[PDB]
Amino acid sequence: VLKTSTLIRLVQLVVSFVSLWLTAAGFLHLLENSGDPFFDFGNAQHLTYWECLYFLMVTMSTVGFGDIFATTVLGRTFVVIFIMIFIGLFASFIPEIAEILGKRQKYGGSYKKERGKRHVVVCGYITFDSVSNFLKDFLHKDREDVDVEIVFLHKGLPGLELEGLLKRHFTQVEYFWGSVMDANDLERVKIQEADACLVLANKYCQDPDQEDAANIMRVISIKNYHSDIKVIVQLLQYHNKAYLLNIPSWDWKRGDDAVCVAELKLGFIAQSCLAPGFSTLMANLFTMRSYKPTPEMSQWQTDYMRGTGMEMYTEYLSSAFNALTFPEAAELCFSKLKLLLLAIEVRQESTLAINPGPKVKIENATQGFFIAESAEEVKRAFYYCKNCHANVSDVRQIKKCKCKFDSTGMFHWCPDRPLNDCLQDRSQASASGLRNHVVVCLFADAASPLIGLRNLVMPLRASNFHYHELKPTIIVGNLDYLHREWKTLQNFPKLSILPGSPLNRANLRAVNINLCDMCVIVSAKDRNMEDPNLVDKEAILCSLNIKAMTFDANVPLITELANDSNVQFLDQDDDDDPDTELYMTQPFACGTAFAVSVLDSLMSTSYFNDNALTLIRTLITGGATPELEQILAEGAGMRGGYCSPAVLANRDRCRVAQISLFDGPLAQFGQGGHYGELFVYALRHFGILCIGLYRFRDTSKRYVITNPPEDFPLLPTDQVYVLTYK
Amino acid sequence: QWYSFLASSLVTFGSGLVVIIIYRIVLWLCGWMTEAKDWAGELISGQTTTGRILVGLVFLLSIASLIIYFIDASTNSSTTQQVDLAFNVFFMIYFFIRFVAANDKLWFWVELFSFVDYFTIPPSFVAIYLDRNWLGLRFLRALRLMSIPDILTYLNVLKTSTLIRLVQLVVSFVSLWLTAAGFLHLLENSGDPFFDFGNAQHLTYWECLYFLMVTMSTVGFGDIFATTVLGRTFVVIFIMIFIGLFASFIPEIAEILGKRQKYGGSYKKERGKRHVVVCGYITFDSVSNFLKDFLHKDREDVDVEIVFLHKGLPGLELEGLLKRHFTQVEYFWGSVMDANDLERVKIQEADACLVLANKYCQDPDQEDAA
């Protein structure tokens, strides 16, 4: 019955206490009632056995009533002896009793599931910093949906900061002590009955490949216990995605996903090089943001907040859109229904397609891809008819039912060059007349972990762009680092690795940041180890260094920041409180900053909307097909081949780009037009789709507006985010 | 008195479980249904405003019964009898809504708050029925004070883990102390069935806590004592319970009160008094040299008050040196990065700021960047 060492030691001490307590009473019962041989049995007080324990237990407890007492001399001696014994005896065992009762698992037990209540499990790297970001975007106040109860399952005991944060969100969150490997730890949480499971990974690590193997191993055990379960994973390197495909029960068709850090982190940064501030547009689009226009705010801050509230929503279309083109479809959506369209799920093995040409038509029951204020407004797409809902002024009334290249042919390719071809000195960099190009300030040691710079360069070298249009990249960092990463980067056109640190102004002035499209800053050192606030000191100094540097200030910049509160230190004109939240701050609206913590918030979005993570990758990477994942898994690398005319037809796809209204045919609207007139004129004649604006701050920072209303003015010096098809 | 009222309380518990056991055996061997069931759960939830207000009434109205007990016990069908019964009807209908809402039946009928309802309510009905008052077990309504941490954590007065754990243990102490007194108040005044109610010492509720708190504290006066055999057994039980119960929580109480920021708060600036801030590498060796040349005796100038602001807690050597120069120096726990740590020192109002660096270091370039 007894088994563990704690229970046996406890039960042993229970008996000794009672036996000694009972036997000592009988000892007094003899002495008190008898009397003594010294006085010759003169005194002899009568006490029962039951009313002698009362005397002992009180003296045992060090209370001392003085209600019952020993008048006999033989009794008092035994009492002093018993007090002398018990203090020495009992106090020696309290340390060993304290180790039994003290040393115990604080949390444990099992999950209690209510009838008709969904719940999700969380695994892996569970710490204050990771969880705090996650819980905000999962349990955001502005969200009309059932409170699906989160269930953390970490091995170790949580910290003092986190313990309060778990107890603060009391009703919605539960914690347990246990790993994801033991079948006993899974059966307690009821994962077969549960909806979904997540695997948050340590982003900042020494050995990233060993960290992913653990997170892959965790998925194996989960998928071993129950095959038909939804699982989502954080990896660090892109190449590790192949090891999930090796698991047989893994099915991306049936809800399983994989969120790469490196793919998305550099991917957002890459798209900013092509069209600045797109990183913020996307970050604000997919994540959850609170709309709250207060009277203290200025005009530019208020309109920015309106954009952040607009989010991704999908739903089926009505019968009215059948046998129409995508441009003809979107006109009815924007004019009458007052909504935007990005894509349609085209049947075939179905696939997604962002803003297709007029050749492709719409079939019955096709899933639309919308951006709007809320999900309630998107219902108007479903409830619609040409005959019935024709001339309606107020749109709220409508709610009636009864009416050279890769093997794939997606990126540009080059032969297996050695590093000494693309290497340069300061003189060779300056001698080369570089203008309109990308710069990458890379901070790293020789013995530092790999970021995976391939995912920055890859989307810059899409087959969408012609050979002359490609922006050449100029990486600045340590050699011993880049020697490792060269095996990935070697097969890309127009690279130029310069050695030395990016704080030497001679290195920068040779490269020409003066004439540049976008200067990226990335760290690769062991961060979040020693200090919390002095993490991005090298990134902050570098941005300041370039702004201060002048030549015969107005420079495009973007910085990778681990900690969010470090955004404070960047700009000069900080008209903001320290208590203000990240997204409302100046530089995050301008796109000069970018947080890594945005990737944790994407874990939530992938759970709720199934066709979200797909949409993101198609916008970011250019054309990352699943064919490449299998080909890159082989180890041969990017295979060449000049391809057939059938494969080269795949390059004709959409790309993100930015258009200004200073010159061109659209400049007529810039004097004093509206956004609605720009939208329709763009879509019909040219075949162009506009997403949002990118204005000057006042009348060279530039804030962002994602999908404004129809009746919205347009200045001459404005810029617009656009999805071209050429 | 002891049997007549206590018999009627046992009838509700006795005959009540017979309904469920026969009902369960039918399931074993072999809208009105679930419309009220979903509504009962939605009504009494906690997340809903109706759930918070309904539980908020239970918190207030339970105390009203306990307030009557203090007056009724001390003075030893009136107007107070009628007011007490009005609350007990609300607890009976509240008992029905939980019974329907909860999935458990046999598990539900054996609970802490369920046991309160069986002994408190039926004698209050019987008191007005018979038209003869009894003290009974109205003190048990003190157990419903234990929902104070639940109200405050939802209201968000309490926030940190230290304050919530401390406030939780405050209520349990007082409730157990009050309820135990009423237990003795019953046993001491009644007597016993073994001697056949021969001995029966009379003690008030107010002058029974004095007996418990002394024995609780391990003082042992022997001014008031239990002559009854039933009382003494409860006393030994209570001493056996309290030593085991209280000593287990002292470790967890010690971690709450022990683990706290020693220094903190904010700087108090006198009118027309300059002060300077010091940052960075603050250690005995660096500071001792600095303070001598700042606060040198041969110096005719105003004693500008130095203000150290280091993150970590200072050492045993330095703590004395800061306390030695008491009037001229102040210390605080905090970094120079947080805006909350700057605003407390009043750096806008302050004169100057300094940054002492670690001279002897492995990586000097990273030290300067900081």
DSSP line for A330-360: HHHIIIII--EEEEEEE----EEEES--TT-
Q: Is A718 annotated as a binding residue?
A: no
DSSP class of residue A295? T
DSSP class of residue A364? S
DSSP class of residue A472? P
Q: Is A571 annotated as a binding residue?
A: yes
Give the type of residue at B68. Answer: I
Give the type of residue at A133. Answer: N
Interatomic CA distance for residues A166 and A122, integer angstroms: 13
Q: CA B222, B227, B229, B233: dihedral to nearest 10 degrees?
A: -20
Give the sheet arrangement for strand B329-333, strand by strand: B329-333, B305-310, B275-280, B352-356
Question: Rounded to 5 degrees, what are φ and ψ at A589?
Answer: -80, -35
The resolution of the experimental structure, rounded to one decimal in Å, is 3.8
DSSP H or E segment with residue A120: strand A119-124
CB-based contact A578 B339, cutoff 8 Å: yes
Is B234:B211 a contact under the CB 8 Å cutoff? no
Give the type of residue at A694. Answer: Y
Give the type of residue at B8. Answer: S
Question: Rounded to 5 degrees, what are φ and ψ at A313?
Answer: -145, 140
Nearest to A538 among B259, B340, B369 (CB): B369
Interatomic CA distance for residues A621 and A169, integer angstroms: 37
Q: Region of A220 please: left (phi>0), alpha (psi -120 to 50) or beta.
A: alpha
Nearest to B161 among A101, A167, A577 (CB): A167
Tell me the β-bridge partners of A176.
Answer: A153
Give the sheet arrangement for strand A518-523, strand by strand: A498-499, A473-477, A438-443, A518-523, A557-561, A593-595
Tracing tokens 């990017």 back to the chain, one arrives at: A638
Q: Smallest Cα–Cα separation from A501: which of B145, B43, B369, B273?
A: B369
Sign of torsion over alpha carbons A267, A268, A273, A278: positive
Give the sheet arrangement for strand A351-354, strand by strand: A311-316, A367-372, A340-346, A351-354
Mutate to test the interface with A, among B232, B248, B366 (most CBs of A within 10 A): B232
Residue A577 C-alpha, separation from nearest chain B C-alpha, in angstroms: 9
DSSP class of residue A674? B
Q: For residue A123, what are its two tokens? A: 């695994």
Interatomic CA distance for residues A218 and A257, integer angstroms: 15
Spatial neighbors of A696 by CB under 8 A, at least 6 apart, are A702, A715, A717, A718
Residue A167 C-alpha, separation from nearest chain B C-alpha, in angstroms: 7
Residue B219 C-alpha, separation from nearest chain A C-alpha, in angstroms: 5
DSSP H or E segment with residue A234: strand A230-235
Nearest to B370 among A53, A115, A534 (CB): A534
Is B369:A541 a contact under the CB 8 Å cutoff? yes
Q: For residue B9, what are its two tokens? A: 């309380």
CB-based contact B161 A147, cutoff 8 Å: no
Mutate to test the interface with B, among A57, A61, A106 (most CBs of B within 10 A): A61
Interatomic CA distance for residues B357 and B136, integer angstroms: 73
Nearest to A171 among B47, B160, B236 (CB): B47
Question: Rounded to 5 degrees, what are φ and ψ at B321?
Answer: -65, -35
Interatomic CA distance for residues A122 and A233, integer angstroms: 10
In A, residues 90-109, which contact B (CB 8 Å cutoff)? 98, 101-102
| Nearest residue on chain A to B245, alpha-carbon basis | A101
Rg (CA), chain A: 35
Q: For residue A404, what are its two tokens? A: 């050279």
Is A401:A383 a contact under the CB 8 Å cutoff? yes
Spatial neighbors of A230 by CB under 8 A, at least 6 apart, are A195, A196, A197, A254, A255, A256
CB-based contact B47 A64, cutoff 8 Å: no
Residue A193 C-alpha, separation from nearest chain B C-alpha, in angstroms: 19
Give the count of Cβ contacts less than 8 A between chain A and B: 69
Tracing tokens 């982003």 back to the chain, one arrives at: A203
Give the sheet arrangement for strand A655-660, strand by strand: A655-660, A719-724, A689-693, A705-706
Give the type of residue at A475. Answer: I
Question: Rounded to 5 degrees, what are φ and ψ at A251?
Answer: -135, 105
DSSP A556-608: -EEEEESSSGGGGGS-S---S-TTS-GGGSHHHHHTSEEESTHHHHHHHHHHH
Q: For residue A196, what are its two tokens? A: 């979904």
Q: Smallest Cα–Cα separation from B220: which of A60, A72, A24?
A: A60
Residues of A in contact with B370 (CB under 8 A): 531, 534, 537
The counts of H helices and E strands in chain A are 26, 20
DSSP class of residue A296? T
Is A649:A463 a contact under the CB 8 Å cutoff? no
Question: Rounded to 5 degrees, what are φ and ψ at A657?
Answer: -155, 160
Question: Rounded to 5 degrees, what are φ and ψ at A293?
Answer: -80, 105
Interatomic CA distance for residues A87 and A90, integer angstroms: 6
10 Å Cβ neighbour count for A644?
A: 9
Q: What Å distances lie between residue B287 and A552, B283, B306, B331, CA to CA?
A: 47, 6, 11, 12
Q: Is A347 annotated as a binding residue?
A: no
Interatomic CA distance for residues A675 and A709, integer angstroms: 7
Q: Is A348 annotated as a binding residue?
A: no
Number of alpha carbons in the 13 Å side-chain half-sphere of residue A516: 23
Is A122:A152 a contact under the CB 8 Å cutoff? yes
Number of alpha carbons in the 13 Å side-chain half-sphere of residue B241: 13
Whether chain B has a CB inside 8 Å of the CB on A26: the answer is no
Rounded to the nearest 5 degrees, what angle is found at the Cα of A225, between the Cα atoms of A224 and A226?
Answer: 95
CB-based contact A61 B221, cutoff 8 Å: no
Mutate to test the interface with B, among A99, A168, A536, A563 (most CBs of B within 10 A): A168
SS3 label, residue B47: coil
CB-based contact A61 B232, cutoff 8 Å: no
Nearest to A533 among B103, B225, B337 (CB): B337
The contacts found for B349-352 with CB under 8 angstroms, 24 or more apart, are B349/B269, B350/B274, B350/B275, B350/B276, B350/B277, B350/B307, B351/B274, B351/B275, B351/B276, B351/B304, B352/B276, B352/B277
Q: Smallest Cα–Cα separation from A51: which of B200, B214, B185, B225?
A: B225
Residues of A in contact with B46 (CB under 8 A): 171
10 Å Cβ neighbour count for A148?
A: 17
Residues of B in contact with A565 (CB under 8 A): 337
Nearest to B222 among A66, A171, A577 (CB): A66
DSSP H or E segment with residue A221: helix A208-225
3-class secondary structure per residue, A252-279: HHHCCEEEEHHHHHHHHHHHHHHCCCHH
Whether chain B has a CB inside 8 Å of the CB on A170: the answer is yes
Whether chain B has a CB inside 8 Å of the CB on A63: the answer is yes
CB-based contact B218 A168, cutoff 8 Å: no
Residues of B in contact with A53 (CB under 8 A): 236
Interatomic CA distance for residues B54 and B51, integer angstroms: 5
CB-based contact A578 B103, cutoff 8 Å: no
Interatomic CA distance for residues B359 and B370, integer angstroms: 13
Q: Smallest Cα–Cα separation from A198: which of A129, A132, A151?
A: A151
SS3 label, residue A284: helix
Sign of torsion over alpha carbons A426, A428, A429, A431: positive
Mutate to test the interface with A, among B337, B361, B368 (most CBs of A within 10 A): B337
**Beta strands per DSSP E along A447-573:** 473-477, 498-499, 518-523, 557-561
Interatomic CA distance for residues A298 and A576, integer angstroms: 12
The contacts found for A157-164 with CB under 8 angstroms, 24 or more apart, are A157/A106, A157/A107, A158/A126, A159/A127, A159/A128, A160/B161, A160/B259, A161/A128, A162/A127, A162/A128, A162/A131, A163/B161, A164/B159, A164/B160, A164/B161
Mutate to test the interface with B, among A157, A167, A526, A541 (most CBs of B within 10 A): A167
Interatomic CA distance for residues A452 and A238, integer angstroms: 8
Interatomic CA distance for residues B161 and A198, integer angstroms: 27
Question: Rounded to 5 degrees, what are φ and ψ at B44?
Answer: -95, 90
Question: Rounded to 5 degrees, what are φ and ψ at A714?
Answer: -130, 120
Is A476:A402 a contact under the CB 8 Å cutoff? no
Spatial neighbors of A476 by CB under 8 A, at least 6 apart, are A439, A440, A441, A442, A498, A500, A501, A502, A507, A508, A511
